[PDB]
């Protein structure tokens, strides 16, 4: 009937959320409000050195949603070591930035800060309704949920340099062999190859979303992915459904129904764990006071039923096994949800821990004078060309079978002379 929780770690520094990377290492990455990402071993100890540390770049605050917002590991992080993080920064109240990083090819437990690669920089006038949740879909594309930021129409109608991305969901294909751009746009996308609309935008209708539950195994056949959010602005919930094999010509509409009852709501999630068999497949949402509930639709009728879940909250987490976590409020700690009806670690939930290893990919190996795309392509910096950016490129370029070597020094074979042969 009732659920129980066990503490895991304390002394945490303003936690906001936690997740895994899907690489066997069973490491639990813990996001901290002020710009730190700490690692938790499958055992239960916190590393000394932070996985990520950008507290200088991120301008947070207490009250105020500013700070480290979200982080998402690439589906193939095991190979490319690519991750993506969203946070607020400044110098217009601030900027919501979305950047790609790459773990050190020397140390798997810390990211090379030099590998920073900015994708989006959203202008923000206030410090509420920010959003910024990152996530991948079975399709492989990167999703980005953004609140409206309280940017009224008047605001966007008389001010320059405003996002035009706020209050909507974005769809980005990060797996590109293109270099002139940070990312590409899926053909699936509605505004793909458009001349009047932002190709990035997938759908809109958001305002002040908490943590949106991501059901990756919808009970439907056509729907391959569904995202359920909880707004507060009034107050309701809205969900976005998605089909894998579908080329969008138009904007997917956000379903605005009202499942919940009255009070606020921090966020939610869909249980994919192995620990509990009864909680499996159930949506779970709670508030800041530890009050939880479960949601469930139906194959037929498609009606939603709400059942209370027996048991200050800041956020939730999910390890590789699917087990969910609670983050509360150096006061800050992590808990773990456990179903008393079954053992803490059933004989079937067992899993061998494959420690995180160094990047051995082809690109990470021999790619200099450029960067590796999540697909392995080495995009050369200016003045370079060739597969892995070793072939020097002069200015002007060498002619008559001329080969560039030094800074703009062509090299003419026998019979030719001159700066460019």
């Amino acid at each position: 009937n009732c659920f129980c929780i066990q503490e895991v770690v304390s002394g945490l520094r303003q936690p906001v959320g936690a997740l895994h990377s899907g690489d066997g290492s069973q490491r639990l990455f813990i996001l901290e409000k002020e710009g730190y990402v700490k690692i938790l071993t499958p055992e239960g100890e916190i590393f000394k050195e932070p996985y990520l540390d950008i507290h200088k770049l991120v301008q947070s605050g207490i009250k105020d949603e500013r700070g480290l917002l979200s982080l998402a590991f690439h589906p193939n992080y095991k190979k490319n070591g690519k991750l993506y993080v969203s946070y607020t920064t400044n110098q217009h109240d601030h900027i919501l930035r979305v950047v790609e990083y790459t773990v050190s090819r020397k140390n798997p437990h810390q990211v090379d800060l030099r590998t920073a690669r900015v994708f989006l920089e959203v202008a923000e006038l206030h410090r509420k309704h920010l959003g910024g949740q990152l996530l991948f879909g079975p399709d492989g594309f990167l999703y980005i949920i953004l609140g409206d930021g309280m940017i009224t129409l008047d605001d966007m109608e008389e001010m320059d340099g405003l996002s035009d991305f706020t209050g909507s969901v974005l769809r980005l294909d990060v797996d590109t062999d293109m270099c002139n751009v940070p990312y590409s746009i899926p053909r699936s996308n509605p505004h793909f190859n458009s001349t009047n609309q932002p190709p990035e935008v997938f759908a809109h209708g958001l305002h002040d979303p908490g943590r949106c539950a991501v059901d990756r195994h919808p009970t439907d056949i056509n729907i391959n992915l569904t995202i359920l959010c909880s707004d507060s602005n009034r107050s309701s919930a809205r969900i976005l459904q998605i089909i894998k094999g579908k080329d969008y010509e138009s904007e997917p509409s956000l379903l605005e129904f009202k499942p919940f009852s009255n009070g606020p709501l921090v966020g939610g999630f869909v249980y994919r764990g192995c620990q509990s068999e009864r909680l499996y497949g159930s949506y779970v949402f709670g508030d800041r006071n530890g009050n939880f509930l479960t949601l469930q639709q139906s194959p037929v009728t498609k009606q939603w039923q709400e059942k209370p879940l027996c048991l200050h909250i800041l956020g939730f987490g999910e390890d590789e096994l699917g087990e969910v976590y609670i983050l509360s409020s150096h006061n800050g700690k992590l808990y773990k949800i456990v179903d008393p009806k079954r053992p803490l670690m059933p004989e079937e939930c067992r899993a061998t821990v494959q420690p995180a290893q160094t990047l051995t990919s082809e690109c990470s190996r021999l790619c200099r004078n450029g960067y590796c795309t999540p697909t392995g392509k080495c995009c050369c910096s200016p003045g370079w060309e060739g597969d892995f950016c070793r072939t020097a490129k002069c200015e002007p370029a060498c002619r008559h079978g001329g080969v560039c070597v030094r800074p703009n020094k062509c090299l003419c074979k026998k019979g030719y002379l001159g700066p460019q042969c």
Binding site: H92, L153, M156, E157, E158, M159, D160, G161, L162, D164, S194, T195, N196, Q197, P198
Partner: protein, 145 residues
């Protein structure tokens, strides 16, 4: 006439280059002597959302020439100005709105679809730099004295 694409600008260069609206000399306030170059535009064929009518002559001309082009383009549709000169704040430094040389415009009916062609009309109107800034409005600017 072909419309301007989203996030497209003409000329295809930085706004504050000599080819476009030229460099930025400084913010224009009231206690600044250069405030006398700014004068109200009382064109009855222009909608001011709202001291939003103050602007430079070259701006008044290009804008007045555009006001006609709009109602000439669409049936009973006028040119609407959402932002012009900024008396203080509301903009990042070096914004031509601080010099009354820039304007943000939309159609009266707020038909975002027309915006593309609107920008084009502003280009032919003689604006030194037009830019499809966003879905919500178009940004135009001219040079100074």
């Amino acid at each position: 006439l072909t419309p301007l694409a989203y996030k497209q600008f003409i000329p295809n260069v930085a706004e504050k280059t000599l080819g476009a609206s030229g460099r930025y000399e400084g913010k224009i306030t009231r206690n600044s002597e250069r405030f006398k170059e700014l004068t109200p535009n009382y064109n009855p064929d222009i909608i001011f959302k709202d001291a939003d009518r103050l602007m430079t002559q070259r701006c008044k001309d290009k804008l007045n020439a555009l006001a006609i082009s709009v109602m000439n383009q669409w049936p009973g549709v006028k040119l609407r100005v959402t932002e012009g000169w900024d008396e203080d704040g509301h903009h990042s430094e070096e914004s031509l709105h601080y010099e009354g040389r820039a304007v943000d415009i939309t159609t009266s009916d707020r038909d975002r679809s027309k915006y593309g062609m609107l920008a084009r009309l502003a280009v032919e109107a003689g604006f030194d730099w037009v830019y499809y800034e966003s879905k919500a409005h178009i940004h135009c600017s001219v040079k100074a004295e």
